[PDB]
Enzyme design. Sequence first.
Site, PDB file in Angstrom:
ATOM      1  N   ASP A 209      -3.075  -2.170  -3.243  1.00 18.72           N
ATOM      2  CA  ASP A 209      -2.401  -1.627  -2.097  1.00 18.72           C
ATOM      3  C   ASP A 209      -1.061  -1.056  -2.519  1.00 18.72           C
ATOM      4  OD1 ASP A 209      -2.817  -1.854   0.801  1.00 18.72           O
ATOM      5  OD2 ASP A 209      -0.823  -2.847   0.740  1.00 18.72           O
TER       6      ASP A 209
ATOM      7  N   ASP B 227       1.702   0.625  -0.057  1.00 18.16           N
ATOM      8  CA  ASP B 227       2.837   0.473   0.856  1.00 18.16           C
ATOM      9  C   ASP B 227       3.123  -0.974   1.179  1.00 18.16           C
ATOM     10  OD1 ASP B 227       3.629   3.271   1.210  1.00 18.16           O
ATOM     11  OD2 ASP B 227       1.612   3.484   2.087  1.00 18.16           O
TER      12      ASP B 227
END
Length: 179
Positions: free
Chosen positions: A20, A22
């Site tokens: 991931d 952000d």
Amino acid sequence: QYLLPEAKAQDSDKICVVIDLDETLVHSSFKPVNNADFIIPVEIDGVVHQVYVLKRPHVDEFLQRMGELFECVLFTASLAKYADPVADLLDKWGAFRARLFRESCVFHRGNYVKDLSRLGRDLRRVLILANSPASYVFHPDNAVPVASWFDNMSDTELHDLLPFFEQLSRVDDVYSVLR
Ligand SMILES: [Mg+2]
């Protein structure tokens, strides 16, 4: 057809980690930030606005080590025009073997979900590192949670997770540890 190609020879032996972006590896903002790690010009509808990018502490040592341990894949709900330039600047080691953006996610109940069954990897050797449970609703047993990061410059979460990943890099079935 699956999301990823067949794993290259130096990768197929290894666990796949989808990572991931952000609030996991970085925090980004349209609001100006004075000592930014990097700044990406991004076009929203014909207008270029500046995205101010902060690097989560220890991310270099994290990505360096994770690229050795695993077949790393960037899986973000954001768009390539923001995320590619970010990855180009973040990934100094060729850690990310592939990149996946918002079109590869599945919009489910208001949330962008990373759907690991679309990868083309045996789920006993797939892991997901993410900051919000909703991004892995379908695969909670494949998940290594991480706190959402914004700007806490004394956060150590990425460094502290590595010994755990050392362990997981070596198991045959990840469900054996993430029972
Ligand atoms: Mg995130």
